[PDB]
Amino acid sequence: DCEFGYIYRLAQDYLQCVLQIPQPGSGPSKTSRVLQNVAFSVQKEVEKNLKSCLDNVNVVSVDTARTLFNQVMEKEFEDGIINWGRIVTIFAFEGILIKKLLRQQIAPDVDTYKEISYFVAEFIMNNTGEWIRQNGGWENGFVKKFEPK
């Protein structure tokens, strides 16, 4: 919880969900299962509401995805506010990016989602990791908030 490895697994779990290529055995964690549901709901909403905007950017490489991600993330969190809903949008956005990359990547490579997962975990750990810890981590913060009633 809250170290790179844990967050990377969450990010990679979510991209495999979006890409419909789950790892067989032994399945995602409780946290990941709760996250997949809420993040996908947000992703759908965003894809609909920013369609034309998202059509006017070309995600042609992992570097394009990384730079677009980092620039968007910087602007999203520039006011210094962190909350669990904003954390969810990070996962929703990497889902949007991997889908665009699958369509638009000039040299399609199959290990790209692992690269996307990496820089997502890097951002989450370095920019929201202290907040996450202070608010209960994934199991006592995120899951407690978002798990079913």
Binding site: E45, L50, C53, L54, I81, G85, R86
Partner: peptide, 26 residues
Amino acid sequence: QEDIIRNIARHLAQVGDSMDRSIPPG
């Protein structure tokens, strides 16, 4: 012209803040 980066960032912040408020303290 329309700033793609800021428009995406602005929307994600709004949706994140909106959803966060939607789920009460539980």
